Design an enzyme around this catalytic site. Structure first.
Site, mmCIF file in Angstrom:
data_model
loop_
_atom_site.group_PDB
_atom_site.id
_atom_site.type_symbol
_atom_site.label_atom_id
_atom_site.label_comp_id
_atom_site.label_asym_id
_atom_site.label_seq_id
_atom_site.Cartn_x
_atom_site.Cartn_y
_atom_site.Cartn_z
ATOM 1 C CG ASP A 19 85.978 30.593 12.238
ATOM 2 O OD1 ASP A 19 86.874 29.845 11.758
ATOM 3 O OD2 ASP A 19 85.153 30.145 13.074
ATOM 4 C CE1 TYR A 45 81.280 29.058 13.379
ATOM 5 C CE2 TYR A 45 80.378 27.270 14.701
ATOM 6 C CZ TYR A 45 81.446 28.053 14.325
ATOM 7 O OH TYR A 45 82.677 27.802 14.884
ATOM 8 C CE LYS A 93 85.693 26.486 12.614
ATOM 9 N NZ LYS A 93 84.671 27.573 12.724
ATOM 10 C CG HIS A 121 83.391 22.322 13.745
ATOM 11 N ND1 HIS A 121 82.207 22.933 13.397
ATOM 12 C CD2 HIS A 121 83.843 22.973 14.847
ATOM 13 C CE1 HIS A 121 81.958 23.919 14.242
ATOM 14 N NE2 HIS A 121 82.929 23.961 15.138
HETATM 15 N N1 LIG Z 1 86.223 25.364 16.227
HETATM 16 C C1 LIG Z 1 85.371 25.373 17.249
HETATM 17 O O1 LIG Z 1 84.929 24.231 17.891
HETATM 18 C C2 LIG Z 1 84.850 26.664 17.786
HETATM 19 C C3 LIG Z 1 84.390 26.748 19.105
HETATM 20 C C4 LIG Z 1 84.106 28.010 19.630
HETATM 21 C C5 LIG Z 1 84.287 29.145 18.843
HETATM 22 N N2 LIG Z 1 84.723 29.019 17.541
HETATM 23 C C6 LIG Z 1 84.916 30.191 16.655
HETATM 24 O O2 LIG Z 1 85.601 31.218 17.338
HETATM 25 C C7 LIG Z 1 84.741 32.332 17.493
HETATM 26 C C8 LIG Z 1 85.011 33.121 18.761
HETATM 27 O O3 LIG Z 1 84.923 32.341 19.929
HETATM 28 P P1 LIG Z 1 83.639 32.490 20.877
HETATM 29 O O4 LIG Z 1 82.412 32.344 20.057
HETATM 30 O O5 LIG Z 1 83.827 31.540 21.988
HETATM 31 O O6 LIG Z 1 83.631 34.014 21.436
HETATM 32 P P2 LIG Z 1 84.840 34.988 21.903
HETATM 33 O O7 LIG Z 1 85.637 35.468 20.755
HETATM 34 O O8 LIG Z 1 85.708 34.347 22.993
HETATM 35 O O9 LIG Z 1 84.059 36.234 22.534
HETATM 36 C C9 LIG Z 1 83.325 36.050 23.709
HETATM 37 C C10 LIG Z 1 82.424 37.250 23.951
HETATM 38 O O10 LIG Z 1 83.205 38.411 24.085
HETATM 39 C C11 LIG Z 1 82.417 39.533 23.760
HETATM 40 N N3 LIG Z 1 83.320 40.587 23.242
HETATM 41 C C12 LIG Z 1 83.900 40.690 22.007
HETATM 42 N N4 LIG Z 1 84.670 41.798 21.976
HETATM 43 C C13 LIG Z 1 84.626 42.383 23.179
HETATM 44 C C14 LIG Z 1 85.228 43.536 23.679
HETATM 45 N N5 LIG Z 1 86.051 44.280 22.916
HETATM 46 N N6 LIG Z 1 84.964 43.876 24.979
HETATM 47 C C15 LIG Z 1 84.119 43.127 25.782
HETATM 48 N N7 LIG Z 1 83.526 41.990 25.272
HETATM 49 C C16 LIG Z 1 83.771 41.633 23.988
HETATM 50 C C17 LIG Z 1 81.361 39.051 22.777
HETATM 51 O O11 LIG Z 1 80.094 39.542 23.163
HETATM 52 P P3 LIG Z 1 79.299 40.591 22.220
HETATM 53 O O12 LIG Z 1 78.846 39.856 21.008
HETATM 54 O O13 LIG Z 1 78.089 41.130 22.983
HETATM 55 O O14 LIG Z 1 80.262 41.729 21.825
HETATM 56 C C18 LIG Z 1 81.418 37.530 22.832
HETATM 57 O O15 LIG Z 1 80.152 36.940 23.095
HETATM 58 C C19 LIG Z 1 83.327 31.795 17.335
HETATM 59 O O16 LIG Z 1 82.421 32.827 16.988
HETATM 60 C C20 LIG Z 1 83.561 30.774 16.249
HETATM 61 O O17 LIG Z 1 83.660 31.394 14.979
HETATM 62 C C21 LIG Z 1 85.006 27.796 17.016
#
Ligand SMILES: NC(=O)c1ccc[n+]([C@@H]2O[C@H](COP(=O)([O-])OP(=O)(O)OC[C@H]3O[C@@H](n4cnc5c(N)ncnc54)[C@H](OP(=O)(O)O)[C@@H]3O)[C@@H](O)[C@H]2O)c1
Length: 316
Positions: A45, A50, A79, A112
């Site tokens: 994704d 980004y 997106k 997006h």
């Molecule tokens: N459509 C939209 O408006 C939008 C908005 C937000 C996000 N997104 C997409 O969704 C993705 C994910 O959402 P997000 O960016 O909010 O992050 P997330 O998936 O909720 O992860 C949050 C944090 O969790 C940590 N993490 C991952 N695996 C872990 C584990 N096994 N144990 C402990 N911590 C862990 C990561 O840190 P570390 O990197 O240090 O492991 C990361 O910074 C984004 O990267 C993006 O591609 C889209």
């Protein structure tokens, strides 16, 4: 495994999140996306926003060139950014995304956000109060231009992101609709489980795809540092101990068992490999009920910068 979308294409139910804040060097996206694919992620994704599609695309093509996967094995999402909502800019925007990634097509192209912004140089044009300068765009016209991108073969599937139920219904009720959104990618986690929006999506064969499924990256631009840390939640911790997994794995498995496709961002090698273990165990009905009990209407993304936008999806 995969879920069959309403246009007949297949989406892996676990996806790798590639967004990192601008302070992280661009080269890291390349490294970690290769590591994700090597760990078993097939759904990837990204987005124009980004500023990493060059790196993410190279990671995909490198894993093709090194013999690990074929293009048909990867499900690649990008997106349309909100400065390109005007229908005449949709296809050009997509073509930029394809050029950056050096790919012939994306598997999925999303709007997006419903919060249209002034077209121009900036990603995020704001006024003097810090609020983003909105544009007024009929999103049904935006959607028609998305449909043309699918017909041109530039996007295998199209959908939306950050739409509430009513915004989604506007698309579904459009006269002359050719293709329903295959999905709605939204903030979704045990503190904001979106169960009503999920029920609606299920009723229309639209897949809910969860972002911030692990509690978000808690970026100070958008997230209050006083908000509860999802992964420190005592119920998630107790379920982690019961199953000999981790809070993160519990939060991911929860979404899979609800029929939600779930993203997971990590830029850490060990955690990337951990996250694919979501397929190795199950939660019981009682476990799932306990997690459902955590819902508290908490959207981590909570800033003045978009709360005043006319198309802001949340009711605060
Ligand atoms: N459509 C939209 O408006 C939008 C908005 C937000 C996000 N997104 C997409 O969704 C993705 C994910 O959402 P997000 O960016 O909010 O992050 P997330 O998936 O909720 O992860 C949050 C944090 O969790 C940590 N993490 C991952 N695996 C872990 C584990 N096994 N144990 C402990 N911590 C862990 C990561 O840190 P570390 O990197 O240090 O492991 C990361 O910074 C984004 O990267 C993006 O591609 C889209």
């Amino acid at each position: 495994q995969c879920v069959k979308l309403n246009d007949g294409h297949f989406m892996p139910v676990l996806g790798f999140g590639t967004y990192a804040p601008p302070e992280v060097p661009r080269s890291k996206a390349l490294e970690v996306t290769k590591l994700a694919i090597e760990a078993g992620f097939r759904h990837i994704d990204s987005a124009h926003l980004y500023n990493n599609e060059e790196q993410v695309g190279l990671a995909i093509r490198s894993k093709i060139a090194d013999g690990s996967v074929k293009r048909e094995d990867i499900f690649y999402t990008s997106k349309l950014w909100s400065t390109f909502h005007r229908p005449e800019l949709v296809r050009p925007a997509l073509e930029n995304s394809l050029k950056k990634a050096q790919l012939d097509y994306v598997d999925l192209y999303l709007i997006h956000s419903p919060m249209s912004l002034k077209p121009g140089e900036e990603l995020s044009p704001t006024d003097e109060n810090g609020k983003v300068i909105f544009d007024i765009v009929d999103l049904c016209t935006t959607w028609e231009a998305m449909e043309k991108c699918k017909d041109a073969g530039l996007a295998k599937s199209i959908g939306v992101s950050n739409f509430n139920r009513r915004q989604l219904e506007m698309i579904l009720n459009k006269p002359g609709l050719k293709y329903k959104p295959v999905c709605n990618q939204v903030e979704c986690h045990p503190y904001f489980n979106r169960s009503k929006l999920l029920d609606f999506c299920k009723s229309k064969d639209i897949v809910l795809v969860a972002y911030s499924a692990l509690g978000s990256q808690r970026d100070k631009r958008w997230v209050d540092p006083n908000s509860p840390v999802l992964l420190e939640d005592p119920v998630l911790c107790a379920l982690a101990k019961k199953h000999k997994r981790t809070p993160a794995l519990i939060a991911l498995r929860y979404q899979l068992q609800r029929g939600v496709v779930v993203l997971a961002k990590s830029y850490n090698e060990q955690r990337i490999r951990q996250n694919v273990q979501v397929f190795e165990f199950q939660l019981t009905a009682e476990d799932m009920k306990a997690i459902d009990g955590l819902d508290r209407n908490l959207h981590y993304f909570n800033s003045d910068s978009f709360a005043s936008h006319p198309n802001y999806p949340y009711s605060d």
